[PDB]
Structure formats: structure tokens, C-alpha cells
Symmetry: C2
């Protein structure tokens, strides 16, 4: 019961974990739409594989919350909502299927970059706070985002 | 269906749309940075963000040259991604009770913004290269490198279980 309820670095870490939890849920909802829009088979397949990984990433975040002593929960993330809105609106503006695949690759890379920033931040805070225990899960998620980004950077349309 | 349904027809059109989107983001960043500077307590963070504000103004000047080369105005696309990043940064700052915690949040949100810009510049460079725009590739690469350097400086700012 405070208006400014983020009082400590531990509170900030918990808030960030709830923010990324919500973001992973939203990505699981957004990805099928992107996969349906994708023409290039490698792009469609790559996104489908990352959708499966994102489902696993949520399970790893459930493990993080369990290690911290609580049930999982999310908080709204305006950054992922804005990224998803931008991707959806831009897709509607594109007439050519190959141009659309280029936009899908770029928007997917922007999402991976947001995830890389967030996991990197959460890991650094966790380590500063003596929470090495949760870093193993966060690092597994982070490295899947890095891998997805790298693979997107190489997609040949 | 929105205003411009199916109006992006070519990779040149998509590059133009992406450049207008990052231009808008840079403009928004010039508006947001003074707020983050005022909120920041640590002088290396506050004075450091002031330097990134000066660099962002230079990046807009670089983009102005790119638009000149395309013969197109830089206005015309808003960026829901930067708008969401900046409003998340605002929201989170409003929830924080402690100056040291607020500085940690400022760094993290500034790093998230640098990562967005790094994603977009990387994409735009690749499209500009494919389209044969050598100077535009150089200008965008210069901008990209400033965002990478800013992110690294944020990763290194020396600020600060049962
Ligand atoms: Fe993820
Ligand atoms: Fe967020
Ligand atoms: Fe991802
Ligand atoms: Fe954008
Ligand atoms: Fe920047
Ligand atoms: Na039209
Ligand atoms: Zn648009
Ligand atoms: Zn910056
Ligand atoms: Zn910038
Ligand atoms: Zn919040
Ligand atoms: Zn909150
Ligand atoms: Zn703890």
C-alpha cells in the first residue's frame, strides 16, 4: 500500500520480471499472426520455432517466480504493446509479399532487441542483488533471443 | 483499414517509411531526454544523458542529409515502438520512491531505447546497401555506432539473497 511502491532494487527487479512475463505472453499471441503473414519458408519456420521457444521461456519465468517465492504475474508493458502495434500497422500498409517479409524480419529483430535489453538488465540486477539463483533461467531465455536475432539478421529474402 | 493500406509497394518505399519512423523516434528522444536528465540524480548519468541528447541532435542532422539525398521530407511516420518505450520509462519513474532505484530504472530504460535504435539502424543499413545508397549507408552506420557507444557507456556507468 504505497503510491510509489517500487522502494528498493529488489522491488525494481520483481517489477521488471512481471513486465517481461507479460511481454513474453504478448509475443506468443503476436507470433502466429506474423507467421501467417510470412511468405518466405525459412522466415515462417524460424518464427514457428521461436514461438515454441517463447512458450518454454514463460515456463522458465514461472521457475524464476517460484525461486523468488511467489506465483507468476505480469504487469502491462507499453514497450511490447507499441512494438506489436507498429508491426501490425506497418504490415497493413505493405502491398508486396517480399516487402512484407522484409518488414516482418525487421519487426521480429526489434522485438528480439527489446527482449535482449530486458533480460540483460534483469540479469545484471539479479547478480547485484545476490540472486544468482534466478540468473540461470534468465540467461537461457536471453541466449534464445540472441540466437533468434542473429538468425533473423541472416534471413535471405 | 487505416490511412495507407497497401501503399508501401517497393523496398525503396519501405526504406523511406523506416527512415521516417526512426526520424520520428529521434525527435521523440530529444523531447524525452531532458525529462530523464532532470530525474537522474547521479551526475555521471545526468551529464552523460546530456551528451547523448547532443548526439541525438547530430543524428537528426545526419538523417536530414539522408532525406535530402532521397528527395523526400522526413515527416510522415510516427513510431508506436518509441512511444511505448518512452511512456513505459515515464510510468516506471512515477512508481519509484528512491533516487538510487530511479537512476537504475533510467539506465535500464535508456538501454532499451538504444537497443530499439540499434535494431532499426541495422535494418535500415541493410536495406540501403541492397538499394545501392552508399552515402545513406555511411550516415546510418555513423548513427548506429553512436547508439552502440551510448549503450556501452550505459552498461558501464558505475552507479551503485534472503
Ligand atoms: Fe522471449
Ligand atoms: Fe516492458
Ligand atoms: Fe525472442
Ligand atoms: Fe518505430
Ligand atoms: Fe540513442
Ligand atoms: Na492508398
Ligand atoms: Zn506506417
Ligand atoms: Zn542514448
Ligand atoms: Zn538516436
Ligand atoms: Zn510499472
Ligand atoms: Zn508498475
Ligand atoms: Zn530476493
Amino acid at each position: 500500500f504505497f503510491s510509489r511502491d517500487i522502494q528498493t532494487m529488489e522491488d525494481l527487479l520483481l517489477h521488471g520480471l512481471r513486465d517481461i512475463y507479460y511481454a513474453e505472453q504478448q509475443i506468443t499471441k503476436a507470433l502466429p499472426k506474423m507467421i501467417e503473414q510470412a511468405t518466405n519458408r525459412d522466415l515462417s519456420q524460424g518464427l514457428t520455432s521461436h514461438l515454441e521457444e517463447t512458450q518454454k521461456q514463460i515456463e522458465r519465468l514461472d521457475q524464476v517466480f517460484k525461486k523468488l517465492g511467489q506465483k507468476p504475474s505480469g504487469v502491462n508493458c507499453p514497450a511490447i504493446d507499441g512494438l506489436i502495434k507498429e508491426a501490425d500497422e506497418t504490415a497493413g500498409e505493405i502491398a508486396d509479399k517480399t516487402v512484407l517479409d522484409a518488414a516482418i524480419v525487421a519487426n521480429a529483430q526489434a522485438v528480439e532487441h527489446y527482449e535482449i535489453a530486458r533480460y540483460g538488465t534483469l540479469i545484471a540486477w539479479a547478480e547485484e542483488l545476490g540472486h544468482d539463483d534466478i540468473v540461470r533461467f534468465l540467461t537461457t531465455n536471453l541466449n534464445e533471443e540472441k540466437a533468434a536475432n542473429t538468425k533473423l539478421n541472416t534471413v535471405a529474402l
